[PDB]
Design a protein around this ligand. Structure first.
Ligand SMILES: O=C(O)c1c(CN2C(=O)Cc3cc(Cl)ccc32)ccc2c1OCCO2
Ligand SMILES: O=C(O)c1c(CN2C(=O)Cc3cc(Cl)ccc32)ccc2c1OCCO2
Ligand SMILES: O=C(O)c1c(CN2C(=O)Cc3cc(Cl)ccc32)ccc2c1OCCO2
Ligand SMILES: O=C(O)c1c(CN2C(=O)Cc3cc(Cl)ccc32)ccc2c1OCCO2
Ligand SMILES: O=C(O)c1c(CN2C(=O)Cc3cc(Cl)ccc32)ccc2c1OCCO2
Ligand SMILES: O=C(O)c1c(CN2C(=O)Cc3cc(Cl)ccc32)ccc2c1OCCO2
Lengths: 149, 149
């Protein structure tokens, strides 16, 4: 459980926002890229796995799942690469709802920055700090620290 | 002390590596930028503070300490911006030692990537996972989680 993350890709202003969600807490990291390519996904995962203990990643689509660059990064980083098929058929709805909420947050800060990438990082900040009550950031630290503490 | 971070800026291959260290654990995040400007430092801090609970940052120099773009990001993110003067005079050697170690790691992976930014993120991964027997990544989550609970 504490090592599991889900990748998610969404589009806004003709750019791509790649998101990784820590499935047990709802904590996220996100970046703006020009387009989702295996190389960008690989580098996003290498960043993520240097910062948090990423044991398993459910990939967002079959292109990333197949990408040899992605598989090379997963190998390098000790990550088990898995599919992101909604085996629980409520996973597709959860992912859609997350993107809608993320885009709502982005719209709430959009005017405070020139560049979309800045507004996305403001939106990561607001989501991870939001109380609902613990925040996502509190939950992920409690989850991982319990895992041997 | 669980919210305290130190910024640090080092140079390699004619590029700038900006580093934030979590003082109590030694955990780091790092990025490659063309040059240290207020805008890049501000954006780096906004990313950091969306991901970890950053209460105080000791800035790496007086230009960032003065930068109104940095001060605006610190206000936005709820960060107390402080100087990074080694009032504890060993603090100078500790920072240069960290840079030399980081550049050693980078040299150990440099050949496995075309682009410096990828080698820096590999180095972040290796440092944060290194056992010294707990890792930096383990220490920071234990520090912050003990603070929550
Ligand atoms: O409120 C949401 O819908 C939301 C969520 C909801 N969420 C959880 O709490 C757990 C979880 C697992 C997965 Cl697989 C996807 C989303 C979520 C996560 C991230 C977000 C969200 O909203 C916007 C920004 O990021
Ligand atoms: O206008 C922008 O998008 C931008 C900004 C804009 N801006 C400021 O000038 C002060 C500030 C605080 C915060 Cl919390 C967010 C954005 C900004 C800062 C750094 C950047 C930016 O672009 C991307 C890289 O660095
Ligand atoms: O402030 C939060 O909601 C938060 C927290 C909350 N919190 C803790 O549980 C421990 C802690 C220490 C400090 Cl000194 C400030 C806030 C927190 C932890 C990690 C985060 C957070 O938000 C950013 C993502 O990581
Ligand atoms: O071994 C080191 O010197 C080292 C350190 C040492 N370190 C700690 O453990 C605590 C600490 C506080 C501060 Cl203010 C600076 C460095 C460190 C941190 C990060 C690194 C390091 O080397 C590799 C890259 O990151
Ligand atoms: O050659 C690079 O530096 C690079 C790479 C190189 N590379 C692979 O092709 C597979 C791989 C695994 C890992 Cl663990 C690190 C780098 C690479 C991937 C993504 C990138 C890169 O550069 C920019 C960001 O995206
Ligand atoms: O693997 C580590 O050394 C590590 C850890 C170590 N560890 C824990 O304390 C709990 C845990 C759960 C899992 Cl499932 C894997 C590793 C760890 C935590 C955070 C990190 C780590 O390294 C990456 C940065 O964040």
């Amino acid at each position: 459980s504490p090592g599991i993350w889900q990748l998610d890709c969404t589009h806004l202003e003709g750019k791509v926002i790649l998101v990784a969600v820590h499935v047990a807490s709802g904590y996220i990291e996100a970046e703006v890229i020009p387009a989702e390519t295996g190389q960008e996904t690989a580098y996003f995962l290498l960043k993520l796995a240097g910062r948090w203990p990423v044991k398993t990643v459910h990939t967002d689509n079959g292109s990333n799942f197949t990408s040899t660059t992605v598989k090379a990064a997963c190998w390098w980083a000790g990550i088990k690469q898995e599919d992101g098929i909604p085996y629980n058929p409520q996973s597709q709805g959860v992912i859609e709802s997350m993107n809608k909420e993320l885009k709502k947050i982005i719209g709430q800060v959009r005017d405070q920055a020139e560049h979309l990438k800045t507004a996305v990082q403001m939106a990561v900040f607001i989501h991870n700090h939001k109380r609902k009550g613990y925040s996502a950031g509190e939950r992920i630290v409690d989850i991982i620290a319990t895992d041997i503490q």
